[PDB]
From Swiss-Prot:
Any single biological process term in GO: proteolysis
Catalytic class of the enzyme: hydrolase
Sorted UniProt keywords: Aspartyl protease, Disulfide bond, Hydrolase, Protease, Signal, Zymogen
EC number: 3.4.23.22
Organism: Cryphonectria parasitica
Keyword ATP-binding attached: no
Catalytic activity: Hydrolysis of proteins with specificity similar to that of pepsin A, prefers hydrophobic residues at P1 and P1', but does not cleave 14-Ala-|-Leu-15 in the B chain of insulin or Z-Glu-Tyr. Clots milk
Disulfide bonds: C255-C290
Protein family membership: Belongs to the peptidase A1 family.
Catalytic residues (UniProt): D35, S199
Protein's recorded name: Endothiapepsin
Occurrences of domain Peptidase A1 (ranges): 17-328
Superkingdom of the organism of origin: Eukaryota
MF (Gene Ontology): aspartic-type endopeptidase activity
Length: 330
């Protein structure tokens, strides 16, 4: 089997992407944030504290003939941005782009943090990291991909995120029309539960490539590119007036700037992030200070190849017995 679903930016900055997901019988379609940095499929629901729901579409298990309470199971998750959610668990039928999994754990939120409430466009998350990170207790649950894997034509999914445009998540096949040149594959460590890999270096604009190992995670659920302070400083030094602002929470730059590109290495291959992808616009409405899309990972504890990086590539998440990651230009 295979599946193919379009993923759509939630706003004009590509802050996140939502993908329609069918849950239950008859189908209830919710727009979920596919997150290769976590491993829980959770949804706003009929159980979510009413004051914490503001415009989201909810899953109502009592209206699904295939829903079953997973008795005794609870979940609770905290994300890198400080947001969180928690609740109980149902199993139900879940379909993405025509690919169906029966008996998928659907984590029903009883509580969500303010950032979730305030974002009416995201109805929940669909985790695509390794199932070892799943938070369900006392019986850990599998991700949608893990459950689908054996049925897939090939044990892979691909992320093809758009810049200010829709893109695609495919399951079970590699669309050879969706990229240019060849795909370069690179080793993955699953030791921390992430799609963790080592970039071979970077360049800023038209500058020379610096060969240096940068360990990080491929994370579709993180907006920006978070890299070591040395790398980030070298980038922003090429933008007149750019500075790190403790009050704003990162590097800012004059909105009048033209940003240089940023290149990262994948083995001997190179992925180029155009400068425009690094512009996250005014820090507040009407400001002439703009927020940068490359930020320091210092104090996160891990480097993160978030959407800024991933949307410059066609990315293969190869879930074979020995997982790997592939990157192609597009």
């Amino acid at each position: 089997s295979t599946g193919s679903a379009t993923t759509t930016p939630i706003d004009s900055l590509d802050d996140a992407y939502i993908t329609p997901v069918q849950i239950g019988t008859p189908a209830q379609t919710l727009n979920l944030d596919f997150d290769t940095g976590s491993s829980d499929l959770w949804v706003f629901s009929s159980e979510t504290t009413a004051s914490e729901v503001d415009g989201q579409t909810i899953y109502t298990p009592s209206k699904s003939t295939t829903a079953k309470l997973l008795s005794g199971a609870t979940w609770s998750i905290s994300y890198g941005d400080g947001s969180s959610s928690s609740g109980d668990v149902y199993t139900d039928t879940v379909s993405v782009g025509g690919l169906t999994v029966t008996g998928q754990a659907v984590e029903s939120a009883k509580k969500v943090s303010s950032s979730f409430t305030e974002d009416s466009t995201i109805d929940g998350l669909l985790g695509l990291a390794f199932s070892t990170l799943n938070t369900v207790s006392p019986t850990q649950q599998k991700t949608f991909f893990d459950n689908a894997k054996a049925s897939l034509d090939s044990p892979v999914f691909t992320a093809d995120l758009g810049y200010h445009a829709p893109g695609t998540y495919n399951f079970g096949f590699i669309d050879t029309t969706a990229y240019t040149g060849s795909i370069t594959y690179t080793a993955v460590s699953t030791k921390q539960g992430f799609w963790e890999w080592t970039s071979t270096g970077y360049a800023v604009g038209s500058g020379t490539f610096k060969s240096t190992s940068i360990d990080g995670i491929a994370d579709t659920g993180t907006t920006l590119l978070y890299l070591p302070a040395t790398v980030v400083s070298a980038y922003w030094a090429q933008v007149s007036g750019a500075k790190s602002s403790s009050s704003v929470g990162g590097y800012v730059f004059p909105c009048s700037a033209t940003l240089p590109s940023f290149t990262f290495g994948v083995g001997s291959a190179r992925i180029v992030i155009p400068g425009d992808y690094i512009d996250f616009g005014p820090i507040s409405t009407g400001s002439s200070s703009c927020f940068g899309g490359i930020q320091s990972s210092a104090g996160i504890g891990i480097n993160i190849f978030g959407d800024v990086a991933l949307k410059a590539a066609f990315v293969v998440f190869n879930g074979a017995t020995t997982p790997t990651l592939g990157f192609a230009s597009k």
